[PDB]
Structures are given as structure tokens and as C-alpha cells.
Amino acid sequence: YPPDLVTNVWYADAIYPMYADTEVFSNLQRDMITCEAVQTLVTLVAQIS
């Protein structure tokens, strides 16, 4: 380990820059739109089949 390793300081220092993630929400909205597409597709198919 680092000879002067303080877990609280090192982790906190790495975490502050590390904590900048928002990709999940955007991906969720895309998946949500994909799910609406799936349902809409089935409904159109139902009209035709």
C-alpha cells in the first residue's frame, strides 16, 4: 500500500472527481423509448395480424 496511506483521505480525494456520472438516466430514457416502440410495434402488428 502507499507508505503514508490514509484510507479516508485517499478514497475521498479520488471520489470527488470520480462522482460525475449521469449516463444511466439518459440510457434509461432511451430504453424507455425502445419499450414504447416495442408496444407500438405489437399494436400495429395486432391491427394487421
Could you tell me the smallest distance in angstroms from the CB atom of residue 21 to another protein?
22
Nearer to another protein, 13 or 37 (CB): 13
Which of the residues 1 through 49 are near another protein (CB under 8 A)? 6, 8-9, 12-13
Q: What are the start-end ranges of the H helices in the chain?
A: 7-18, 23-48
User: 2-9 long-range CB contacts below 8 Å, 24 or more apart?
Assistant: none
> What's the rounded Cα separation, in Å, for the pair 19 and 25?
15
Nearer to another protein, 12 or 42 (CB): 12
Binding site for another protein (CB under 8 A): 6, 8-9, 12-13
